[PDB]
Amino acid sequence: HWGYGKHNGPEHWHKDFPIAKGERQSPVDIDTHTAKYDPSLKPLSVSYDQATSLRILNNGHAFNVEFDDSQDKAVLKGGPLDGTYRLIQFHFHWGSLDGQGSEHTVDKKKYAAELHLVHWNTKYGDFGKAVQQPDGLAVLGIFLKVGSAKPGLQKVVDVLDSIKTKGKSADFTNFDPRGLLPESLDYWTYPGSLTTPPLLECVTWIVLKEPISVSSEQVLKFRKLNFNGEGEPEELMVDNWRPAQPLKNRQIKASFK
Ligand SMILES: Cc1ccn(O)c(=S)c1
Ligand SMILES: [Zn+2]
Numbered sequence: 001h002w003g004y005g006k007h008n009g010p011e012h013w014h015k016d017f018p019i020a021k022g023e024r025q026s027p028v029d030i031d032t033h034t035a036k037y038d039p040s041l042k043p044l045s046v047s048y049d050q051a052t053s054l055r056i057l058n059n060g061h062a063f064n065v066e067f068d069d070s071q072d073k074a075v076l077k078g079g080p081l082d083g084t085y086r087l088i089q090f091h092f093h094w095g096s097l098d099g100q101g102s103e104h105t106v107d108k109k110k111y112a113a114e115l116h117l118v119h120w121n122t123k124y125g126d127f128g129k130a131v132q133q134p135d136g137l138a139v140l141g142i143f144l145k146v147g148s149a150k151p152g153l154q155k156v157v158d159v160l161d162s163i164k165t166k167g168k169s170a171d172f173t174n175f176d177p178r179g180l181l182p183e184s185l186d187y188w189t190y191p192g193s194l195t196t197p198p199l200l201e202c203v204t205w206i207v208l209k210e211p212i213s214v215s216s217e218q219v220l221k222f223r224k225l226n227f228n229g230e231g232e233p234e235e236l237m238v239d240n241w242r243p244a245q246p247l248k249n250r251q252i253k254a255s256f257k
Contacts, residue, residue, distance in 0.1 A: 152179020
């Protein structure tokens with residue numbers, strides 16, 4: 001099945017997911033000089049005060065911190081978006097080395113990791129129905145650079161030992177995802193896709209300009225996770241990112257000058 005190795009990695013995915021070679025694939029490189037300022041963009045509204053985290057799951061490819069999405073409790077709106085998008089999970093993609101790991105790049109620059117906060121458009125009733133729509137998802141993307149520790153990430157880092165292998169999960173209530181955000185909400189935006197199979201072209205990408213800093217030791221702990229299940233030979237969960245895909249017939253807009 002699909003993964004990030006030599007024989008099942010991003011160069012293979014197109015065989016089971018033909019949309020891998022489609023017209024609005026993610027991630028892309030963000031050419032800062034070509035991304036036009038759009039003064040019609042609104043400020044981003046991130047309303048996470050009432051977020052209810054539930055659980056953290058190692059799904060064999062990343063770990064997802066899941067949220068209660070049965071009511072409007074943590075929502076994204078405004079920016080490029082029409083209407084309301086509810087947070088359902090967040091995860092990360094990261095590298096084996098500090099100099100790679102992000103999916104989006106900025107003038108070809110790779111960050112050490114990238115956080116994806118996944119939201120679905122509440123006009124479509126649930127996540128499953130949202131992913132059958134071209135405007136079904138909004139994914140807020142945040143780069144991580146190695147530097148000082150991010151205090152608000154530490155609870156996530158401390159629980160990883162308990163979900164080392166594929167299929168393990170742990171209670172993860174009362175986590176405040178506001179602690180993962182940078183100061184500025186300046187962003188670039190463009191239409192794309194999930195960066196993992198099924199690679200569906202549902203996503204308004206909103207990619208923050210300001211990275212967050214995490215410590216060396218924080219990202220080190222991400223890299224001790226395993227892709228394999230318990231009882232199977234150890235394959236470290238690192239380099240679970242897809243490289244930049246062709247931009248094709250898309251313009252990236254900037255929210256800021
Ligand atoms: C919903 C979903 C699941 C996995 N990934 O990587 C992304 S970007 C979005
Ligand atoms: Zn992702």
